[PDB]
Ligand binder design. Structure first.
Ligand code: SAM
Ligand code: ZN
Ligand code: ZN
Ligand code: ZN
Length: 217
């Protein structure tokens, strides 16, 4: 099997909805570290603490703010698409990744719950194959047709990555972050049961984890 084709996008395509968070969180009290060399808003950050990215024009740390990862597309660069046992295609990293590190934004079309169920009737044959993540209050990020390499990341009952919902300039967007340190050649995975949507067509899980749950979704 050849990999699924899709329309690569650099950012989310908003169709019929706006997943506005309800706050432009601004202005932490992080102190700008004195030499340009080092990066700020690291752990104590009043923005980070609530999963909000800082805004470039209010943040006391200016260009050393490391809390604007998704807005600046600070995607890792060593992802490879590969043929992955019986899971079809997967994504692995070519170089070690550290716990908590941002990996990539998960990109797609942002549609309402309704619109996704139409696509599912009119186009998808009532199975999305987990090419879609819940975003917020009935909105869905649909990567079945448009997205980025993150759509190829497989499920594991013992995931080494997770999806996080961030408020970014007043809009919910979703990052993949490492849950644990990872060496080169490691396949990326996250728990679809937590992050993905309602699809009642369950599928057998091949994650191969001692305590695998046997089924996905
Ligand atoms: C969101 S797509 C991921 C990429 C997909 N493997 C491909 O080739 O394009 C999810 C589909 O991949 C496969 N898959 C992902 N994780 C799996 C797992 N843990 N066990 C069995 N199949 C899995 C299933 O066919 C699932 O519906
Ligand atoms: Zn800060
Ligand atoms: Zn900041
Ligand atoms: Zn499993």
């Amino acid at each position: 099997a050849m990999a699924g084709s899709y329309k690569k996008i650099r950012s989310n395509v908003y169709v019929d909805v706006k997943p506005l968070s309800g706050y432009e969180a601004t202005t932490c009290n992080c102190k700008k570290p004195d030499d340009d060399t080092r990066k700020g808003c690291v752990d104590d950050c009043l923005n980070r603490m609530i999963f909000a990215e800082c805004s470039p024009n209010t943040c006391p740390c200016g260009e050393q703010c490391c809390n604007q990862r998704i807005q600046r597309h600070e995607w890792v660069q060593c992802l490879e698409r590969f043929r992955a046992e019986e899971k079809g295609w997967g994504i692995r990293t070519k170089e070690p990744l550290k716990a908590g590190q941002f990996i990539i934004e998960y990109l797609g079309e942002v549609v309402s719950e309704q619109e996704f169920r139409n696509r599912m009737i009119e186009q998808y044959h009532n199975h999305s194959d987990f090419y879609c993540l819940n975003l917020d209050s009935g909105m869905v990020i649909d990567s079945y047709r448009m997205g980025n390499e993150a759509r190829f990341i497989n499920h594991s009952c013992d995931p080494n990555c997770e999806m996080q919902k961030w408020s970014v300039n007043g809009v919910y967007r979703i990052g993949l972050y490492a849950l644990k340190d990872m060496p080169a050649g490691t396949e990326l995975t996250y728990d679809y049961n937590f992050h993905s949507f309602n699809v009642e067509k369950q599928q057998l899980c091949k994650c191969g984890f001692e305590k695998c749950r046997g089924i996905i979704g």
